[PDB]
């Protein structure tokens, strides 16, 4: 562990997140722990969506995640669907779902 990311055990870039927090007009100062915590949250939520999107890709015999699979992952997960309730995923389409009363 040499970079701040490594020291935190993260892949996401602590140093960069720190600089973004400082340049963003968020407060007068940003403590050293903030970008570490924020990077870690970003990294974990990124892993959630990737886990789930990779699962959707595999269910359809694909080995490459496309926007469809991100949409399926989000919309089929109650928690991600709540988090991203006002998000539109370009080229994501919608979930296959027909109202029961409409079926023969």
């Amino acid at each position: 562990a040499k970079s701040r990311s490594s020291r935190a055990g993260l892949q996401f870039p602590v140093g960069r997140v720190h600089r973004l927090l400082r340049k963003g007009n968020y407060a007068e100062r940003v403590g050293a722990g903030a970008p570490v915590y924020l990077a870690a949250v970003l990294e974990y939520l990124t892993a959630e969506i990737l886990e789930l999107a990779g699962n959707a890709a595999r269910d359809n015999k694909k080995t490459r995640i496309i926007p469809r699979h991100l949409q399926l992952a989000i919309r089929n997960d109650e928690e991600l669907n709540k988090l991203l309730g006002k998000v539109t995923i370009a080229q994501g389409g919608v979930l296959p779902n027909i109202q029961a009363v409409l079926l023969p």
Binding site: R7, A8, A27, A32, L38, L45, L50, L70, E79, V87
Partner: protein
């Protein structure tokens, strides 16, 4: 305009699904996601600091922000991840 996190997204993908790729358009979606969530959390963290007349955003403001912004179950996981990272970072100091 917006910040790119592609390299990092790729690394996370390699850990969770080592033999799965990701398309260029899907990467664009992932970069929008990361920027969105960054902005939400930082925004609320700034609000919290101002409400409490604190000049500094600390890890406490990020954590409260996460608890406010995420649904409860997902928040629990995020908080445990943030806390673990800060702990590791502070340890080998």
């Amino acid at each position: 305009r917006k910040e790119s996190y592609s390299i990092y997204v790729y690394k996370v993908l390699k850990q969770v699904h080592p033999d799965t790729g990701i398309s260029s358009k899907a990467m664009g979606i992932m970069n929008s996601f990361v920027n969105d969530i960054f902005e939400r959390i930082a925004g609320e963290a700034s609000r919290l600091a101002h409400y409490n007349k604190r000049s500094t955003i600390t890890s406490r403001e990020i954590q409260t922000a996460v608890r406010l912004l995420l649904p409860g179950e997902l928040a629990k996981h995020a908080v445990s991840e943030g806390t673990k990272a800060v702990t590791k970072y502070t340890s080998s100091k």
